[PDB]
Amino acid sequence: YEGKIINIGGTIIKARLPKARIGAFYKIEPSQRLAEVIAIDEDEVFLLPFEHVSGMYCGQWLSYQGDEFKIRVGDALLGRLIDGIGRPMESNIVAPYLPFERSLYAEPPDPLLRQVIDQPFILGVRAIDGLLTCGIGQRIGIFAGSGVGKSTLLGMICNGASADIIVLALIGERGREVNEFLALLPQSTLSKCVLVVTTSDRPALERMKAAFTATTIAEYFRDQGKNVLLMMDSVTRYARAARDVGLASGEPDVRGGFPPSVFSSLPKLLERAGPAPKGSITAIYTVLLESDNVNDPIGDEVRSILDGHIVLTRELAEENHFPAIDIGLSASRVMHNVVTSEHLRAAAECKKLIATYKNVELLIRIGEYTMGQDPEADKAIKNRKLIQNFIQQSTKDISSYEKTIESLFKVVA
Amino acid sequence: EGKIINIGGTIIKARLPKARIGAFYKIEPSQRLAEVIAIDEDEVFLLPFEHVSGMYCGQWLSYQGDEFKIRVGDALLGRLIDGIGRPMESNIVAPYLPFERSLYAEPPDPLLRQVIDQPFILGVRAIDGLLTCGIGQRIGIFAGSGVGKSTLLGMICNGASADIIVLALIGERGREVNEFLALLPQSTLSKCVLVVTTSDRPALERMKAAFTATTIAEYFRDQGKNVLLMMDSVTRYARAARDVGLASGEPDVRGGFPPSVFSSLPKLLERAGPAPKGSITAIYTVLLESDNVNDPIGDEVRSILDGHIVLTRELAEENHFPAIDIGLSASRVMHNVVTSEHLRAAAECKKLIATYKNVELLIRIGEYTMGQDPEADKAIKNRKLIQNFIQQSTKDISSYEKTIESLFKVVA
Amino acid sequence: EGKIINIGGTIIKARLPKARIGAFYKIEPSQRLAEVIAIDEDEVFLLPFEHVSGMYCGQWLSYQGDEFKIRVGDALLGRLIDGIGRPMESNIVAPYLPFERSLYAEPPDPLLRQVIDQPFILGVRAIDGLLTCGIGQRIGIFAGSGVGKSTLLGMICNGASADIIVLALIGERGREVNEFLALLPQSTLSKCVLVVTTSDRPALERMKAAFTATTIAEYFRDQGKNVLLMMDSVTRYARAARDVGLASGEPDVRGGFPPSVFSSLPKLLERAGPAPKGSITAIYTVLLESDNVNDPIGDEVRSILDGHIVLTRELAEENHFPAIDIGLSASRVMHNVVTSEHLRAAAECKKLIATYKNVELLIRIGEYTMGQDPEADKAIKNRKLIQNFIQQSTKDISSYEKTIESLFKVVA
Amino acid sequence: EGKIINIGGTIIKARLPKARIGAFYKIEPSQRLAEVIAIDEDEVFLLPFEHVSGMYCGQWLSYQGDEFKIRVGDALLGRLIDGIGRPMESNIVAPYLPFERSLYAEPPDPLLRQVIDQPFILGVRAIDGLLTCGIGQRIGIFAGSGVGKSTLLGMICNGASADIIVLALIGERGREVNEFLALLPQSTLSKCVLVVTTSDRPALERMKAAFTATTIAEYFRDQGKNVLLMMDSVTRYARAARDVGLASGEPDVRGGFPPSVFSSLPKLLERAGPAPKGSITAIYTVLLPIGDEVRSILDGHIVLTRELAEENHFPAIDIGLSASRVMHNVVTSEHLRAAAECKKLIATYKNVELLIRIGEYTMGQDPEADKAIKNRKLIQNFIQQSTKDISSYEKTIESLFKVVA
Ligand SMILES: Nc1ncnc2c1ncn2[C@@H]1O[C@H](COP(=O)(O)OP(=O)(O)O)[C@@H](O)[C@H]1O
Ligand SMILES: Nc1ncnc2c1ncn2[C@@H]1O[C@H](COP(=O)(O)OP(=O)(O)O)[C@@H](O)[C@H]1O
Ligand SMILES: Nc1ncnc2c1ncn2[C@@H]1O[C@H](COP(=O)(O)OP(=O)(O)O)[C@@H](O)[C@H]1O
Ligand SMILES: [Mg+2]
Ligand SMILES: [Mg+2]
Ligand SMILES: [Mg+2]
């Protein structure tokens, strides 16, 4: 009715319709599918459809629907599954009464009202609680390569941690995993859990906006005054989808593909989850790397945005050392605030012993290390299988925070 | 309908007013086809089905059909199919197929997948004892060229047991078609559908042949059966999609590949798994652009599939066949499949292999004197048992009980 | 005075005939400002101050200013300012800033700069005992991600003795503005100006916060007092200017960066320093792309800046904090400042650290007979005194006399 | 004389007919100027020196020239000069300058370069006792950061037997020009004519500073005077001409440098040699990619090292790996062989100090290292002195000949 699609191909369509506000979404008039305006030219507009692009033609019409795409949240979406658009997954249900329409692109809190975080957040993994330590309110990434440890460790965290609300986004991952995550969490956890599931099958728009849907639901349950744990599996799938859309919209390449829109819109997503006046969002994001190099474009940028990074390495997964986290290469930017100095000194000595043995281990496997001459290296070896039975852990085993730090004191000295 | 104005060599472009994208057109005098891949307000980009030589400007295009749907039915069992769905063996009568299916369908709904917990016996002791497969798991075989990908699919054709075996041979040798028919017995070839396009064919017919194999496997899944899909070199699909997408004017995001091969590979690989009725267990051969596993296609297909078996060239040079590197390999579904005792025995055998790989260069140089480590002497002592457990000949298959009891005898 | 013709991601384009550069316009339906960054002879490139929410074609523009100016004055202390210039705390009453200044001034005359002779007491034992800073020196702190740039500015800013501190937090997490105010006591918060912009803010606030901080520092310099300016990740300025200029029709040159970044960064980064009345002393945190050596924006900042502290994460992996690599870092302005015996003690224990970094191998390998290398014998005996002099705690600040006394007893 | 088409950040495009590459044009309302890098059939890509803000569509460009030449005369001795040529300060008034010459002059071909004679005394006693240098010889100094090369340059300006001394502080920092001029006397400044430019200044005039200083030194070469040229940090000329080159548009070849700097640096360095009018002793400093290309292109490298400068042994030069290639054509055979035997008397100490760090080395048969141990301190106070310690040429000769005893 308003315009005509005049260019079909790739991820974006292009239309001819004047006076289009940017970000408004338009329905394809005979064929019930709709598309969001991402950019405008002097008369022609770039649109990104919500579904696949097959079956279209030149001069196909476009109707006007709304100024902004908004999702509809409420308190009646706990224990239920949502896609990236906002509509529910399951159809054996009656769909709930969600009363509050919320926009999808909001603001972070005032930087003066973001308090300092000084309470520990316990995950149940002995390594990430003893050596590193999370805090109630921070956001922390799990940086690994392909098929190393990210999902499993995130399942161990979901099984071990406990918040008032749990919002779990599975964006751009395999569809076989939505029943594994539903199997490894109990009904006492499922009663406070919202899944936002976008499979890797889906278009670029759903796989790009599922992260914002999960962040919007998490901040809705934050504004009621509760501590909500957000867990977002592969924020890099958002980064890939935004790369595809931004390159199809005609933007350059900076730092290995990845237009400036990606590095501009990652902080608009990641700054929305932290401490707040009412409640706080503790966030745990997993990051896939383009090799096992930690110095990726997206790996380095999301490492410079987040408040803690947990680096998992493949050469500790070749050795059946699970969870495969590299202690020397991973850090936790809030553990000097959330815990006493005695735990801090013990964790520092355990990190120093791990790095000392890794500095020595090469000249043990070629038979040149001589015992008794270096006092720091010897104590790095005499405790080696005493520190490692602390640092590696089974999947179905959760630990308490007390015997964790008691094992740490027993392991270091 | 319209006329052709450019011919480049991979894609052509034409003056077609208001063509549906995806609809296939016909070159009018010369009996060839093409399909629409992009539209530019009066000028469509077309990908021809056959070779491009002979065309001229202003050559006409006739219309037929809104999409290229293949013709499928129950009478495909025991016969060979072209990549776009023709019967290849022309010495026999054409089969009667009642149904039409388009090549691009949807995966099953994610809440209807029912996490897999039954084993799938392959016959190779290394992907039965140490790695284990599931009914519904899609597996990858990652190697360099010449390392043994096709030998191992030949080993697991005559050892595995499904209802319908759907074997795609896309992008591979024409000489292979008969050698894969020399491994299949008559009780197995009477239930096998073999979709083969070779490396000579145009880029479309190597692109749209994995989708043909998946559509035939989905038709045989939806009847209530168990399908064993196996593709040979899915990276040949990835390279056909690469040079078509780069001819179509698209940027180069990673290692030479457009983003339209990274967005179109999950909507191929995710259609092969568990289902509300039936199942497809799929095995994909993946060739790596060097011996490095961090090839972009190797990395992306490792991040999509449910288990990877990396074969190295060091073990192919050391005459360790099959050349499965155990530390680099994994199987996601094994902890739901095997018992706790079998999982413990598998983990301890893998730790023995890693311990010997630690002490190997130290004993090769000559520093290892017997007696310091308790695990290194265990590795040296069980070395020969582990080696003749992992190493297996081509004409040998094991049953699952003999595999697990030999695992228990080897591990301790 | 013109219509907007297209909206990009970061950029606006309009038809403003004979418009100047720097002339900022506001959008008539929507109250928000935008300044001109390029001309294309009828068609200008503007950069907006905010996001692009509803931006229809043909939206009008109205002339507001020929250049953008900020309100400065002496009644700015103890406050928080954003990159634009307006106060960021809203519960407080708005102050009275008397004067206005443009953000683009020129560095002082190089024949009228003073001579740096007296030290700037910094607080950390390594950058006082080994790399001493003078009053008027521009040093930079070079590291990768999360290696400890912001923690070292916390240690400096805690134990700083300057008459007025301007702290620029450019393009970093909103969380840490309260963590910097948690280690500013009231005696140094009553005379500090925080120019803070967060990483989610639009492109030119993140591009102009450095100019706002240097403008405020030059104002309080021209009053006549010495002032400490500390920028946190001027690399965020550099890649904000990269994303602005590179999307305005300007070519990649060395890292994705246009030539305009390399034209506008040595003018910003040099208008600090000594002066005929007053002196800005500046500490620039620099983020590096990789941990490599061929960084197109780290190398030339290293070249045009007199003194640099290099933090390497290979010392942050053995938990050696602060991770200062004393061999890779230098201070061109310390031989003019400290006494000669201070130079001898600093050079001697740098020599001891450099000796023990490779005598350490032939201690572990059992090849070191005592006495054959006496200097190494002096670098093994005093290893512990050095490694308590170098790394210190975050809350462990120390005065200058204790640092030089402990330096002398470490070297002796 | 031409309207400005558009502004591309650092590139101006104009609509003006018939201009040559390198012609510099004039922004008339603001008094700024900008030179031509490329022409189209009627439009012209040129690039500004200064900042580009304040410019609009339709500003005029006054012609005022066709190539840039510097107004150079005899009265520039003792004045501060920009890389373009205008003075630095406004307290002094610009004197009479009759002549002007362009910045380009072709060097003679290398097949017929002259013989070197006539020892040229620099003032540091270490090299003119050990690594001497003639009049027309051009010398490269390879020093580091924090090695004390600025005092070395100030003390080879102070005590040189040259009537004119020309130095180009090309790309220096803000403080470092006063840091350098604080250690030059007034008797030296009344002999100097010196070009300064800072990293504030645009890369275009930061690369034309080298040609300006070379051109002024060629002017004082033609008046029958022995003249010394100094160019401090040739590498900063290299990065400035790099920024001009790939700012105009050119892909790089080696390191990050375009081949334009590899065509311009032998052209800039191959000139300024032994002319029959009384010639021009060039001293060019390079810090430690193109140091290979510089070290293979001029005769004589002097190496200053941090491993020697960590002690109090100034000037921080090591004779064991630096040598000026022309000494037999300069100094006599007695002085040459005595200097070379003192060089190998120093070089055998470092192969025997490490063997007397351990307790093994004795006397009895080693006639070259037993002499270094006794006659060490005369060596080690011959090859070092302070900043304002001058040692004339007719003292270092007999001092070196009583060092060899
Ligand atoms: N902590 C662990 N313990 C045992 N096995 C693990 C562990 N982490 C990963 N694995 C194995 O490695 C494979 C990859 O795990 P997963 O976390 O799914 O990888 P990704 O991080 O790519 O999702 C799985 O199939 C699993 O069997
Ligand atoms: N398990 C095995 N037993 C014996 N020979 C093998 C085995 N695997 C590979 N080979 C040898 O290595 C070569 C590569 O096998 P093939 O499967 O054809 O490579 P590709 O995986 O590239 O198709 C073959 O020629 C074969 O002889
Ligand atoms: N001086 C120090 N002492 C102890 N830990 C430190 C020190 N500096 C940095 N760290 C650790 O390293 C990490 C990086 O700190 P930070 O200063 O935020 O790095 P950056 O600001 O450069 O990203 C922190 O999580 C912190 O725990
Ligand atoms: Mg996963
Ligand atoms: Mg094969
Ligand atoms: Mg920081």
Residue numbers in the entry:
A (entry chain D): 34 to 446
B (entry chain C), C (entry chain E): 35 to 446
D (entry chain F): 35 to 322, 330 to 446
Please give the exact wording used by the authors of the publication that reports this structure:
Class 1 (58,000 particles, 3.34 Å) reveals a homohexameric EscN pore lacking visible EscO density, while class 2 (55,000 particles, 3.29 Å) looks similar but with additional α-helical density for approximately half of a single EscO molecule resolved. The quality of the side-chain density was sufficient for sequence assignment of EscO residues 0 (from affinity tag) to 30 and 91 to 122 out of a total of 125 residues. Extending the structural and functional similarity to the rotary ATPases, both the N- and C-termini of the EscO coiled coil are observed to penetrate the EscN C-terminal pore opening. In contrast to the F1- and V1-ATPase complexes where the central stalk subunit extends ~70 Å into the catalytic core, EscO only penetrates ~30 Å, preventing interaction with all but the C-terminal domains. The two resolved helices of EscO are bound in a semicircle formed by the same EscN helix-loop region (residues Leu395–Glu401) from chains NA through NE, which congregate along one-half of the pore due to EscN’s tilt; this region in chain NF, the most loosely packed chain, is directly opposite the bound EscO and poorly ordered. EscN creates a cradle of negative charge provided predominantly by clustered Glu401 from chains NA through NE (conserved in injectisome orthologues and structurally conserved with the F1 β-subunit DELSEED motif), situated on the apex of the pore-proximal loop.
The ATPase has been proposed to specifically enhance PMF-induced secretion efficiency, as well as to play a role in effector targeting, release from chaperones and unfolding prior to secretion. Each EscN monomer displays three sub-domains: the N-terminal oligomerization domain (residues 1–102), a cluster of curved β-sheets; the ATPase domain (103–372), made up of a central Rossmann fold with seven parallel β-strands flanked by four α-helices on one side and three on the other; and the C-terminal domain (373–446), made up of four helices lining the central pore.
